[PDB]
Amino acid sequence: HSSGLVPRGSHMKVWDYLCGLIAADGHLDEEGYITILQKDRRFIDKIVALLKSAEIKISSLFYDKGAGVWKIKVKDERLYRYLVNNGVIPGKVLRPPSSAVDPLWYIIGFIDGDGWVEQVVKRAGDKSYYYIRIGIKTKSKELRDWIAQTLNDLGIRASRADKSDGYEVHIDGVEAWRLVPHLQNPTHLERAQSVKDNRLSLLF
Ligand SMILES: [Cl-]
């Protein structure tokens, strides 16, 4: 019984997921093209499969040797319009998506596109307990604020931290484990699993 995939069918979430993914890792250009950038090729493969599923044709897929990333080029008017109507501004500060986008699925997409998984440590009676943190960093304060407030509204606790080079939202411990099954980025999934390797993990 296979799960943890981006939903399809009558309650599909492909576009909502892609909205967050592309907001995180994409750029829309003057010509009407969407370019999705990812370093990790096995994640690239999953994106390609999702786009195929949505009937979105790929114009090109090429490894930018300079930047060190794979670029998926897409030329699709309906997708381009959907994206620009959900805070994905063309050029080179993002806005939150509208109410019509499934917020949980946009946020998962965004985590997959540009978030990270790390192990943090809580110090208790002279011992170090490890637990996972999912983090997003963005230059848009408005988007960061919305991600945090939106997760809080869903009942998934999130905190905020302001860094010299950007605005962070943190989803820790149990809260992160509530998102992991939905993440498509295999690097996230492996790093989450690594916390169990510690002799002292807070939750395992
Ligand atoms: Cl944990």
DSSP 83-129: HHTTT--S--------TTS-HHHHHHHHHHHH-EEEEEEEEETTEEE
Say what angle helices 41-54 and 14-25 make with each other, to 10 degrees. 140
| Domain match, 145 and 203 both | yes
DSSP 182: G
Q: Tell me whether residue 198 is exposed, middle or buried, using C-beta atoms within 10 angstroms of its C-beta: 0 to 12, 13 to 18, 19 or more.
A: middle
Helix, coil or strand: residue 36: strand
CA distances from 202 to 83, 125, 132, 190 (A): 39, 13, 9, 18
Enter the tokens of residue 170: 């943190």
Same domain, 157 and 122: yes
Asked if 158 and 203 sit in the same domain, the reply is yes
The CA distance from 75 to 83, in Å, is: 13
With both helix axes pointing from N to C terminus, report the angle between 141-154 and 103-114 in degrees, rounded to the nearest 10.
130
What is the per-residue burial (b if ≥16 Cβ within 10 Å, else e) of 147-174? bbebbeeeebebeeeeeeeebbbbbbbe
Laid out side by side, the sheet with 159-163 consists of 116-124, 127-138, 166-172, 159-163
Element (H, E) at 25: helix 14-25
Do residues 119 and 126 lie in contact, with contact meaning Cβ atoms separated by under 8 Å?
no
Picking from 93, 123, 143, the residue at the C-terminal end of a domain is 93
Q: Are 184 and 105 in contact (CB under 8 A)?
A: no
Please check whether residues 118 and 201 belong to one and the same domain: yes
- CA 83 to centroid of ligand 1, rounded, Å: 33
Q: 140 and 105 in one domain?
A: yes
Whether residues 8 and 33 share a domain: the answer is: yes
Name the method of structure determination.
X-ray
Q: Are residues 124 and 51 in the same domain?
A: no
Q: Same domain for 52 and 119?
A: no
Residues 98 and 88 both lie in one domain: no
Buried b (16+ CB within 10 A) or exposed e, 9-19: eeeebbbbbbb
Q: Is 190 found in the same domain as 107?
A: yes
Q: How far, in Å, from the CA of 202 to the mean position of ligand 1?
A: 6
Measured in Å, residue 131 CA sits from the centre of ligand 1 at: 3
The CA 28 to ligand 1 mean position distance, Å, reads: 36
> Which H helix or E strand runs over 77?
helix 77-84
In angstroms, rounded to a whole number, what is the distance separating the alpha carbons of residues 195 and 204? 8
Give the Å distance between the CA of 110 and the centre of ligand 1: 20
Domain boundary among 93, 120, 144: 93
Domain boundary among the residues 93, 120, 155 is at 93
The total number of structural domains in the chain stands at 2
Residues 108 and 121 placed together within one structural domain of the fold? yes
Range of the domain at 89: 1-93
In a shared domain, residues 88 and 162: no
| CATH classification of the domain holding 30 | 3.10.28.10
Q: What is the dihedral of CA 155, 84, 71, 24, to 10 degrees?
A: -30
Residues 89/97, Cβ–Cβ less than 8 Å: no
